[PDB]
């Protein structure tokens, strides 16, 4: 066996330290962008409507400030979400086109959603009819089955994290989200999204979530007891789907596929 | 209707919305995992307190810096006569300092080692003070993962003080992910039971030689009372050591339990 | 009464204790102590090199991990944990962590060199192991695992990729990245809801041992399916079938090892003197 001594050697490690490339995502800076009016303000920074100077492509630029990211200590959480959302392409999932950073700032290059959140739509329309609701639920189930196929579970689905494209299509935005040898005790979930889907369908039809109370403790009480009532104008299929989705035992909750097969969904989806 | 080639910088600026020499140092009160505690006095107010020095080296070794920031955030915005007060914190290179309330009578662990057992008056009084501190905690939305005699200090009047704080959108979350947080405060209730037992017997009720034995006992609520544990104390502890959390009493039911009412020197 | 001291004499007291606190001894390794040879493999965080200590000329492995990826993946304390565990662990069937050191950009692990590679490799080559190789591997593994448990260490990643081979083909447990420090801090004050499904014991390993035995004799693990759901379902129901060629003593040991209820699984000494093991191993 042959061994290298000192220099010729110390150069080996520093050569392979650079053949450790990992620069394989399009490179970006702030100068590639025109900045427009603010789309929103957040806990860690601000979102601006922006344009790539070259292509004129309209988009959203989320600036997060590394100062208040180091405070709450969510850096690696953010790396997780970013690596997730970068490798994820679907018409009902808001695209992460890219990301970059300087010091004190990390920028997220995101798809622009011109029709805002489903939360604002709910605030302005008070309630949705069954066509709009079933179409939202269909797009949601599509994005969620695509997500579950990529082994990623999004379990913070809610009208504030649902944006709308130009055609009014729903788009999931937030992503805050060994085996063959593991024993039973260490491996005993996705159905959580089915529950959230039931809650969302109810809120779309009625105007508020089925367990809303003026105190959080009362809502604990209602959720644990599955205590809620349907107003008159909620139809039977709608009632049927929402009741199937809001089962206390997660393994009694249908499969997203069954949701997409549900007769109410098929009849009302646009 | 826009363009650029400053704004963000502005929006950033907008988003950006103690010293050791201030103290006389007294005798050391104890040395622990990450540093030492010294008795101290404010040079200006002549107010006695304790100064905990943690050394940033081992803090970064054990990887607990964010955990410690959380500890201090929780404890500082918390003032109750049975919770050790965090007056403040500061730091220099290689050192973080905690300015804390001074507890002159030490830990309940040392007292329990000295006396082996506590009588019923002292025990029920400790439980009263603990339940008061814990109800205040739960009101400020804070659950203490582990109260235990090593984390309980004693003030000048021998009153209890909770010192450590180790592991201290619904409407869309399913029931399986709520019960936990919905009956999460009952954790403390269980611990209270355990503590009461250890206050009267001298050792906790699930003590074993191996950790798997202790797991088995805790999961099955397998424990026995010695002779000298009286009727009402057995009742309180048995109420508190219920396997199902919702079957455990409320803190205000503990504070009104007949045994506690009869034997406690505090309201 | 209490006495309080101001000025220099006070701060020097804290300073003194600072100096007395420092109580952490380890040998001061450096890159200059090593002659580097050909690469042995690549990893998520760096490269393994065949290396030699300058003075002894003693041959070993030098695993270089780059702090950049360690910081990105947020695995720094996980690595510190696994290094602490593997360092204070000396057994003939456990790959030896001679030491570790670091410089900005790099942390180096000085490791025992295993010249015959991974058991995963040889299972790929031979597709299946005969009962003699299998029983011998299980014997060496049970020895290493009983040593691990006795020093309060639950490895949790028993698998052919984590098993290396010495110059004589003897087994070496290699990756301690999921390994954990067993309890005994106390559980005396923990309620049932915070230890039932969230806290295990060493029986984990026993289960894996079973799996491994199966995979040694059959070619694939016994709960293999396409996606997690199926495999999870099979594991939770302990649904597996033996091929016809698996002899009955092997079936007995694997069925004893793969029990849903942890404390029903045998103890390592029961495995080591199981009749099949005794008959087929050295
Ligand atoms: N890609 C986008 N397109 C259009 N509007 C957006 C986009 N991202 C964010 N917004 C607006 O900014 C607001 C706040 O979003 P932000 O703070 O970034 O995320 P979070 O949902 O975590 O609060 C949203 O309510 C939305 O109206
Ligand atoms: N505020 C305080 N008042 C009096 N004694 C204290 C105080 N804080 C710590 N001590 C002493 O230090 C010891 C506990 O040290 P501490 O740093 O709290 O433990 P740990 O380092 O394990 O968290 C006890 O013996 C106790 O007497
Ligand atoms: N101590 C060793 N002796 C000989 N070869 C080794 C040693 N450690 C690793 N190798 C080889 O180098 C490769 C890299 O392995 P390793 O870095 O341990 O995997 P990972 O980075 O996934 O933990 C392995 O596939 C193995 O073939």
Coordinates of N, CA and C in Angstrom, one line a residue, chain A residues 75-162:
Chain A
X75 N -33.7 27.7 11.6 CA -32.8 27.6 10.4 C -33.0 26.2 9.7
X76 N -32.6 25.2 10.4 CA -32.7 23.8 9.8 C -34.1 23.4 9.5
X77 N -35.1 23.8 10.3 CA -36.5 23.7 9.9 C -36.7 24.3 8.5
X78 N -36.2 25.5 8.3 CA -36.4 26.2 7.0 C -35.6 25.5 5.9
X79 N -34.4 25.0 6.2 CA -33.7 24.2 5.2 C -34.5 23.0 4.8
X80 N -35.2 22.3 5.8 CA -36.0 21.2 5.5 C -37.2 21.6 4.5
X81 N -37.9 22.6 4.9 CA -39.1 23.1 4.1 C -38.6 23.4 2.7
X82 N -37.4 24.1 2.6 CA -37.0 24.6 1.3 C -36.6 23.4 0.4
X83 N -35.8 22.5 0.9 CA -35.4 21.3 0.2 C -36.7 20.5 -0.3
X84 N -37.7 20.5 0.6 CA -38.9 19.9 0.2 C -39.6 20.6 -0.9
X85 N -39.9 21.9 -0.8 CA -40.7 22.6 -1.7 C -40.0 22.8 -3.1
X86 N -38.7 22.8 -3.1 CA -37.9 23.0 -4.3 C -38.2 21.8 -5.2
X87 N -38.0 20.6 -4.7 CA -38.3 19.4 -5.4 C -39.8 19.0 -5.2
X88 N -40.7 19.8 -5.8 CA -42.1 19.6 -5.8 C -42.8 20.4 -6.9
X89 N -43.3 19.8 -7.9 CA -44.0 20.5 -9.0 C -45.4 19.9 -9.3
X90 N -46.4 20.8 -9.0 CA -47.8 20.4 -9.1 C -48.6 21.6 -9.3
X91 N -49.7 21.5 -10.1 CA -50.5 22.8 -10.3 C -51.2 23.3 -9.1
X92 N -51.4 22.5 -8.1 CA -52.1 22.9 -6.9 C -51.1 23.1 -5.7
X93 N -49.8 23.2 -6.0 CA -48.8 23.4 -4.9 C -48.0 24.6 -5.4
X94 N -47.9 25.7 -4.6 CA -47.2 26.9 -5.0 C -45.7 26.5 -5.2
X95 N -45.2 26.9 -6.4 CA -43.8 26.6 -6.7 C -42.8 27.4 -6.0
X96 N -41.8 26.7 -5.5 CA -40.5 27.4 -5.0 C -39.6 27.3 -6.2
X97 N -39.5 28.5 -6.9 CA -38.6 28.5 -8.1 C -37.1 28.4 -7.7
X98 N -36.8 29.0 -6.6 CA -35.4 29.0 -6.1 C -35.2 29.7 -4.8
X99 N -33.9 29.7 -4.4 CA -33.5 30.4 -3.2 C -32.1 30.9 -3.2
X100 N -31.8 31.9 -2.4 CA -30.4 32.3 -2.3 C -30.3 33.1 -1.0
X101 N -29.1 33.6 -0.7 CA -28.9 34.4 0.5 C -27.7 35.3 0.4
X102 N -27.7 36.4 1.1 CA -26.5 37.1 1.5 C -26.4 36.9 3.1
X103 N -25.7 37.8 3.7 CA -25.7 37.8 5.2 C -26.8 38.7 5.7
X104 N -27.6 38.2 6.7 CA -28.8 38.8 7.4 C -30.0 38.6 6.5
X105 N -30.0 37.9 5.4 CA -31.1 37.8 4.5 C -31.1 36.5 3.7
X106 N -32.2 35.9 3.6 CA -32.4 34.7 2.8 C -33.7 34.9 1.9
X107 N -33.5 34.8 0.6 CA -34.6 35.1 -0.3 C -35.1 33.8 -0.9
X108 N -36.5 33.8 -1.0 CA -37.2 32.7 -1.6 C -37.9 33.2 -2.9
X109 N -37.6 32.6 -4.0 CA -38.1 32.9 -5.3 C -39.3 32.0 -5.5
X110 N -40.5 32.5 -5.5 CA -41.8 31.8 -5.4 C -42.7 32.2 -6.5
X111 N -43.7 31.3 -6.8 CA -44.7 31.5 -7.7 C -45.7 32.6 -7.2
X112 N -46.1 33.5 -8.0 CA -47.0 34.6 -7.7 C -48.4 34.1 -7.8
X113 N -49.2 34.3 -6.7 CA -50.6 33.9 -6.7 C -51.5 35.2 -6.7
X114 N -52.1 35.6 -7.8 CA -52.7 36.9 -7.9 C -54.0 37.0 -7.2
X115 N -54.7 35.9 -7.0 CA -56.0 36.0 -6.4 C -56.0 35.8 -4.9
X116 N -54.9 35.9 -4.2 CA -54.8 35.9 -2.8 C -55.1 34.5 -2.1
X117 N -55.4 34.6 -0.8 CA -55.6 33.4 0.0 C -57.1 33.0 -0.1
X118 N -57.3 31.7 0.2 CA -58.7 31.2 0.3 C -59.3 31.8 1.6
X119 N -58.5 32.2 2.5 CA -59.0 32.9 3.7 C -59.7 34.2 3.4
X120 N -59.0 35.0 2.6 CA -59.6 36.3 2.2 C -60.9 36.1 1.3
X121 N -60.8 35.1 0.4 CA -62.0 34.8 -0.3 C -63.2 34.4 0.6
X122 N -62.9 33.6 1.6 CA -63.9 33.2 2.6 C -64.4 34.4 3.3
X123 N -63.5 35.3 3.7 CA -63.9 36.6 4.4 C -64.8 37.4 3.5
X124 N -64.6 37.5 2.2 CA -65.4 38.4 1.4 C -66.6 37.7 0.8
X125 N -66.6 36.4 0.6 CA -67.8 35.7 0.0 C -68.7 35.1 1.2
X126 N -68.2 35.2 2.4 CA -69.0 34.7 3.6 C -69.0 33.2 3.5
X127 N -69.5 32.6 2.5 CA -69.5 31.1 2.3 C -69.4 30.8 0.8
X128 N -69.0 29.6 0.5 CA -68.8 29.1 -0.8 C -70.0 28.1 -1.1
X129 N -70.4 28.1 -2.4 CA -71.4 27.1 -2.8 C -70.8 25.8 -2.9
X130 N -71.5 24.8 -3.4 CA -71.0 23.4 -3.4 C -70.1 23.2 -4.6
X131 N -70.3 23.9 -5.7 CA -69.3 23.8 -6.9 C -67.9 24.2 -6.5
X132 N -67.8 25.5 -6.0 CA -66.5 26.0 -5.6 C -65.9 25.2 -4.5
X133 N -66.7 24.7 -3.5 CA -66.2 23.9 -2.4 C -65.7 22.6 -2.9
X134 N -66.4 21.9 -3.7 CA -66.0 20.6 -4.2 C -64.8 20.7 -5.1
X135 N -64.7 21.8 -5.9 CA -63.5 22.0 -6.7 C -62.3 22.2 -5.9
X136 N -62.4 23.1 -4.8 CA -61.3 23.3 -3.9 C -60.9 22.0 -3.3
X137 N -61.8 21.2 -2.8 CA -61.5 19.9 -2.2 C -60.8 19.0 -3.1
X138 N -61.3 19.0 -4.4 CA -60.6 18.1 -5.4 C -59.2 18.5 -5.6
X139 N -58.9 19.8 -5.8 CA -57.6 20.3 -6.0 C -56.7 20.0 -4.8
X140 N -57.3 20.2 -3.6 CA -56.6 19.9 -2.3 C -56.2 18.4 -2.3
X141 N -57.2 17.5 -2.6 CA -56.9 16.1 -2.5 C -55.8 15.7 -3.6
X142 N -55.8 16.3 -4.7 CA -54.8 16.1 -5.7 C -53.4 16.4 -5.2
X143 N -53.3 17.7 -4.7 CA -52.0 18.1 -4.2 C -51.6 17.2 -3.0
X144 N -52.5 16.8 -2.2 CA -52.2 16.0 -1.0 C -51.8 14.5 -1.4
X145 N -52.4 14.0 -2.4 CA -52.0 12.6 -2.9 C -50.6 12.7 -3.5
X146 N -50.4 13.8 -4.3 CA -49.0 14.0 -4.8 C -48.0 14.2 -3.7
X147 N -48.4 14.9 -2.6 CA -47.5 15.1 -1.5 C -47.2 13.7 -0.8
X148 N -48.2 13.0 -0.5 CA -48.1 11.7 0.2 C -47.2 10.7 -0.7
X149 N -47.3 10.8 -2.0 CA -46.5 10.0 -2.9 C -45.0 10.4 -2.7
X150 N -44.7 11.6 -2.5 CA -43.4 12.1 -2.3 C -43.0 12.0 -0.8
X151 N -43.7 11.1 -0.1 CA -43.4 10.8 1.4 C -43.5 12.1 2.3
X152 N -43.9 13.2 1.8 CA -44.0 14.4 2.5 C -45.5 14.6 3.0
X153 N -45.7 14.9 4.3 CA -47.0 15.1 4.8 C -47.1 16.6 5.2
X154 N -48.0 17.3 4.6 CA -48.4 18.6 5.0 C -49.6 18.5 5.9
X155 N -49.4 18.9 7.2 CA -50.4 18.8 8.2 C -50.7 20.1 8.9
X156 N -50.5 21.2 8.1 CA -50.9 22.5 8.5 C -51.8 23.2 7.4
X157 N -52.7 22.4 6.9 CA -53.6 22.9 5.8 C -54.7 23.7 6.5
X158 N -54.9 24.9 5.9 CA -55.8 25.9 6.4 C -55.9 27.1 5.5
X159 N -57.1 27.8 5.5 CA -57.3 28.8 4.4 C -56.3 29.9 4.3
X160 N -55.5 30.1 5.3 CA -54.5 31.1 5.2 C -53.3 30.7 4.4
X161 N -53.0 29.3 4.4 CA -51.9 28.8 3.6 C -52.3 28.3 2.3
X162 N -53.5 28.6 1.8 CA -54.0 28.2 0.5 C -54.2 29.5 -0.4

